[PDB]
Amino acid sequence: TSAQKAKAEERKRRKMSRGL
């Protein structure tokens, strides 16, 4: 699924420490 692919790509910039 689209969200599932987020894990196989969001390795970099793992959401900085800013819940913006």
Swiss-Prot record:
Expression (tissue specificity): Detected in skeletal muscle T-tubules (at protein level).
Phosphoserine, modified sites: S17
Protein modification: Phosphorylated. Phosphorylation by PKA activates the calcium channel. Both the minor and major forms are phosphorylated in vitro by PKA.
Localization per Swiss-Prot or TrEMBL: Cell membrane, Sarcolemma, T-tubule
General function of this protein: Pore-forming, alpha-1S subunit of the voltage-gated calcium channel that gives rise to L-type calcium currents in skeletal muscle. Calcium channels containing the alpha-1S subunit play an important role in excitation-contraction coupling in skeletal muscle via their interaction with RYR1, which triggers Ca(2+) release from the sarcplasmic reticulum and ultimately results in muscle contraction. Long-lasting (L-type) calcium channels belong to the 'high-voltage activated' (HVA) group.
Domain remark from Swiss-Prot or TrEMBL: Each of the four internal repeats contains five hydrophobic transmembrane segments (S1, S2, S3, S5, S6) and one positively charged transmembrane segment (S4). S4 segments probably represent the voltage-sensor and are characterized by a series of positively charged amino acids at every third position.
Subunit structure: Component of a calcium channel complex consisting of a pore-forming alpha subunit (CACNA1S) and the ancillary subunits CACNB1 or CACNB2, CACNG1 and CACNA2D1. The channel complex contains alpha, beta, gamma and delta subunits in a 1:1:1:1 ratio, i.e. it contains either CACNB1 or CACNB2. CACNA1S channel activity is modulated by the auxiliary subunits (CACNB1 or CACNB2, CACNG1 and CACNA2D1). Interacts with DYSF and JSRP1. Interacts with RYR1. Interacts with STAC, STAC2 and STAC3 (via their SH3 domains). Interaction with STAC3 promotes expression at the cell membrane.
Family according to the record: Belongs to the calcium channel alpha-1 subunit (TC 1.A.1.11) family. CACNA1S subfamily.
Protein name from the UniProt record: Voltage-dependent L-type calcium channel subunit alpha-1S
Record organism: Oryctolagus cuniculus
Gene this chain is encoded by: CACNA1S
